[PDB]
Design a protein around this nucleic acid. Sequence first.
DNA 1: TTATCCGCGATCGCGGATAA
DNA 2: TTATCCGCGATCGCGGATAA
Lengths: 71, 71
Amino acid sequence: FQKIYSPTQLANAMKLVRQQNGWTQSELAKKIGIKQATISNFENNPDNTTLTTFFKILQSLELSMTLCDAK
Amino acid sequence: FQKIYSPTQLANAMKLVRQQNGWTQSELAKKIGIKQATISNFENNPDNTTLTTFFKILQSLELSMTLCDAK
DNA sequence: TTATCCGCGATCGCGGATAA
DNA sequence: TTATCCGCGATCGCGGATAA
């Protein structure tokens, strides 16, 4: 897990985790009660995605996050 | 830096960093080109804040973030 | 200093869908 | 399977502000 500085880097990181684990967008969406469409718009167009969507998808990916220094 | 699971925990964590360093919302807003109002709505009502706003404020706080396991 | 207001255009996530 | 569509109500971040 590298340091992440932008919505695009975040979405790329989380899509990679989804794919590495062989999960579909629909599977994740169902587990957390949002639309598959919403996961798709996040992976491809994350700039205006809400923090709520972000934290729900984190949960579905079995992830959390932490702050750290920009170094 | 603890693991964070929700927009509310994230906003509380970042407000604390802002305050511990003695920064005003206006100072941060100016450094990154957003409204002070936007920083205020994030600290108090983060659920629908955009990822963009989040990453810009991170920069102004000299922070980055990383993913990690939900444990 | 910060929470809060107006009016605005833009985009969210929603329900409900589809192609191939 | 996923990117993408419609129509919708809600909220974003914007410029520009204010109280105390």
